[PDB]
Amino acid sequence: PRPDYVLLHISDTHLIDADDRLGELLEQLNQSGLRPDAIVFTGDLADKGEPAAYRKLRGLVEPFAAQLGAELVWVMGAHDDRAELRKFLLDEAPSMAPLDRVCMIDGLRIIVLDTSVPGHHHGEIRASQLGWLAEELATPAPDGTILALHHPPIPSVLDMAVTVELRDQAALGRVLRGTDVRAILAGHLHYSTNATFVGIPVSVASATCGCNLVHVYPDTVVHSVIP
Amino acid sequence: PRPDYVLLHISDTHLIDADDRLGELLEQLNQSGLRPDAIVFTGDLADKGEPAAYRKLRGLVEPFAAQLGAELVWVMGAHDDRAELRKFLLDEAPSMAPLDRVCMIDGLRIIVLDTSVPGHHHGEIRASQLGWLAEELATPAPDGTILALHHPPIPSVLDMAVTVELRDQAALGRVLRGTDVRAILAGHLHYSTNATFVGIPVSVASATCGCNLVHVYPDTVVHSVIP
Numbered sequence: 293p294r295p296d297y298v299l300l301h302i303s304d305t306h307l308i309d310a311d312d313r314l315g316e317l318l319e320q321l322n323q324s325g326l327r328p329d330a331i332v333f334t335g336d337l338a339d340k341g342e343p344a345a346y347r348k349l350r351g352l353v354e355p356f357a358a359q360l361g362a363e364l365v366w367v368m369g370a371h372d373d374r375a376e377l378r379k380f381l382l383d384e385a386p387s388m389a390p391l392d393r394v395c396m397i398d399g400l401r402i403i404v405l406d407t408s409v410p411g412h413h414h415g416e417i418r419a420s421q422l423g424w425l426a427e428e429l430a431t432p433a434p435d436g437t438i439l440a441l442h443h444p445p446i447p448s449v450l451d452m453a454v455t456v457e458l459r460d461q462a463a464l465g466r467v468l469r470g471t472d473v474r475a476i477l478a479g480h481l482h483y484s485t486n487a488t489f490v491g492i493p494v495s496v497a498s499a500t501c502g503c504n505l506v507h508v509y510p511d512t513v514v515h516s517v518i519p
Numbered sequence: 520p521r522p523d524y525v526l527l528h529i530s531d532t533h534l535i536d537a538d539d540r541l542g543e544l545l546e547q548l549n550q551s552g553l554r555p556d557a558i559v560f561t562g563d564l565a566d567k568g569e570p571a572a573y574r575k576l577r578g579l580v581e582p583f584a585a586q587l588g589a590e591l592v593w594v595m596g597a598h599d600d601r602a603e604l605r606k607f608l609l610d611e612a613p614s615m616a617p618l619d620r621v622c623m624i625d626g627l628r629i630i631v632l633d634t635s636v637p638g639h640h641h642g643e644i645r646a647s648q649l650g651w652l653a654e655e656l657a658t659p660a661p662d663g664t665i666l667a668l669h670h671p672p673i674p675s676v677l678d679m680a681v682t683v684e685l686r687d688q689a690a691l692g693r694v695l696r697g698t699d700v701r702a703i704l705a706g707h708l709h710y711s712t713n714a715t716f717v718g719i720p721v722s723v724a725s726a727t728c729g730c731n732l733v734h735v736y737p738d739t740v741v742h743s744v745i746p
């Protein structure tokens with residue numbers, strides 16, 4: 293069976309060792325001869341949101357993605373800094389506004405939502421983001437939508453995880469329910485985890501410091517854990 | 520958040536080294552102080568379906584489960600032998616009939632389906648099993664149903680996997696659709712994998728030779744990969 297799309301789902305890189313942990317993964321997938329349509333990094337890109345760490349991340353990852361002709365999709369995590377990421381990763385003017393973005397890969401919509409709260413480890417989605425997201429999803433994409441965020445909308449199966457979890461999930465669920473979101477890609481957790489949120493599959497990739505392969509079929513989305 | 524149920528999902532033990540790979544996992548979870556309601560083993564219990572290997576498996580696992588007061592749930596895999604498993608694992612009269620079973624854990628239904636084909640590595644579900652399964656699911660369980668089988672009803676993301684995959688999945692899907700099956704537990708693959716089948720979450724546990732924790736919440740089922 294040939295997939296419609298192939299995505300790479302990497303998370304929690306924590307760059308400031310994390311340098312060659314990520315380095316060796318890149319080449320391992322380069323050497324596997326895999327050619328994904330997109331590489332999605334679901335947060336905690338930089339451990340202390342450092343300019344130097346973003347620069348370094350960009351030099352390591354951009355060549356890798358260009359070779360495979362793959363779209364790079366960056367997501368804000370709790371440890372990141374919105375302004376330094378915009379500045380040193382995206383070549384955009386600095387702003388503390390949520391890193392929310394829409395990205396079409398042929399017929400597939402990828403939506404990047406920012407669940408980060410500046411200077412806080414927990415997760416939240418602000419009213420303006422739910423409005424933005426609702427408006428966007430009112431138009432169905434041909435091959436449906438992948439949602440990429442940091443803090444996963446799933447129950448916390450550990451206590452030291454509850455204080456840093458994504459808050460007010462009911463609001464998100466009200467917006468996602470009945471739309472064309474087919475899968476939710478998330479990070480934060482540091483162990484591979486899957487569940488559903490309002491009927492939608494949630495897949496959380498483990499920390500880098502393995503990752504997930506994502507094959508998008510016409511009728512299903514397959515997530516596989518690569519050690 | 521307190522889960523309604525906790526399940527342990529272990530797969531592909533391949534006992535005939537596999538002995539102390541499984542041994543060290545048991546104790547690691549014994550030592551974690553985890554107390555699951557059920558331990559579900561999703562096939563390839565014995566590598567050559569050997570009487571000696573079932574005896575050994577039983578001596579290693581039954582004490583472990585009794586301590587935690589956990590229900591043992593055994594599933595036929597491709598490598599198993601229906602008659603020797605019935606004989607040396609279940610203390611049942613030998614039979615080549617599919618190992619199909621229903622098991623209530625308080626309000627939660629667990630259904631064991633046998634996708635094995637004797638002397639063959641591929642997977643199939645026979646007409647009589649679809650009838651049995653349909654009849655059973657006509658009655659909803661209070662806390663819905665977990666389905667446990669060997670060959671997962673998900674697309675094969677590798678070629679050397681297609682010849683051994685579960686065949687005629689459309690038939691299964693016709694039976695599962697709209698019933699109270701909340702999750703499908705599966706094995707066979709040897710890499711952690713999740714997808715949906717007819718809207719239902721499928722979670723495949725990796726080979727032992729790690730496993731999965733399964734927390735069953737009122738509104739969702741969370742699967743986590745334990746290295």
Ligand SMILES: [Fe+3]
Pocket residue numbers: 304336480
């Ligand atoms: Fe992190």
Ligand SMILES: [Fe+3]
Pocket residue numbers: 531563707
């Ligand atoms: Fe196996």
Ligand SMILES: [Mn+2]
Pocket residue numbers: 335336369370371442479480481
């Ligand atoms: Mn995080």
Ligand SMILES: [Mn+2]
Pocket residue numbers: 562563596597598669706707708
């Ligand atoms: Mn198998």
